[PDB]
Amino acid sequence: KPFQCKTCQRKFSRSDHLKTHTRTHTGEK
Ligand SMILES: [Zn+2]
């Protein structure tokens, strides 16, 4: 169940993983 970040281009194994990660780029809230 591979995931990809559409912000840097890093991969993950879970959707929750991907999310936690991506929110370190903008991490709005
Ligand atoms: Zn990223």
From Swiss-Prot:
KTS motif, short sequence motif: residues: 28-29
Residues in coiled coil: none
Tissues of expression: Expressed in the kidney and a subset of hematopoietic cells.
UniProt subcellular location: Nucleus; Nucleus, Nucleolus; Cytoplasm
Zinc finger boundaries on the chain: C2H2-type: 3-25
Entry superkingdom: Eukaryota
Start and end residues of each stretch annotated as Important for interaction with target DNA: 13-21
Domain note: Binds to DNA motifs with the sequence 5'-GCG(T/G)GGGCG-3' via its C2H2-type zinc fingers. Starting from the N-terminus, the second zinc finger binds to the 3'-GCG motif, the middle zinc finger interacts with the central TGG motif, and the C-terminal zinc finger binds to the 5'-GCG motif. Binds double-stranded target DNA, irrespective of the cytosine methylation status. Has reduced affinity for target DNA where the cytosines have been oxidized to 5-hydroxymethylcytosine, 5-formylcytosine or 5-carboxylcytosine. The 9aaTAD motif is a transactivation domain present in a large number of yeast and animal transcription factors.
Family indicated by similarity: Belongs to the EGR C2H2-type zinc-finger protein family.
Disease implication from the record: Frasier syndrome: Characterized by a slowly progressing nephropathy leading to renal failure in adolescence or early adulthood, male pseudohermaphroditism, and no Wilms tumor. As for histological findings of the kidneys, focal glomerular sclerosis is often observed. There is phenotypic overlap with Denys-Drash syndrome. Inheritance is autosomal dominant. Wilms tumor 1: Embryonal malignancy of the kidney that affects approximately 1 in 10'000 infants and young children. It occurs both in sporadic and hereditary forms.
Additional notes on this entry: Presence of the KTS motif hinders interactions between DNA and zinc-finger 4.
Complex and partners: Homodimer. Interacts with WTIP. Interacts with actively translating polysomes. Detected in nuclear ribonucleoprotein (mRNP) particles. Interacts with HNRNPU via the zinc-finger region. Interacts with U2AF2. Interacts with CITED2. Interacts with ZNF224 via the zinc-finger region. Interacts with WTAP and SRY. Interacts with AMER1. Interacts with RBM4.
Job description of the protein: Transcription factor that plays an important role in cellular development and cell survival. Recognizes and binds to the DNA sequence 5'-GCG(T/G)GGGCG-3'. Regulates the expression of numerous target genes, including EPO. Plays an essential role for development of the urogenital system. It has a tumor suppressor as well as an oncogenic role in tumor formation. Function may be isoform-specific: isoforms lacking the KTS motif may act as transcription factors. Isoforms containing the KTS motif may bind mRNA and play a role in mRNA metabolism or splicing.
Protein name: Wilms tumor protein
Residues of the full protein shown: 381 to 409 of 449
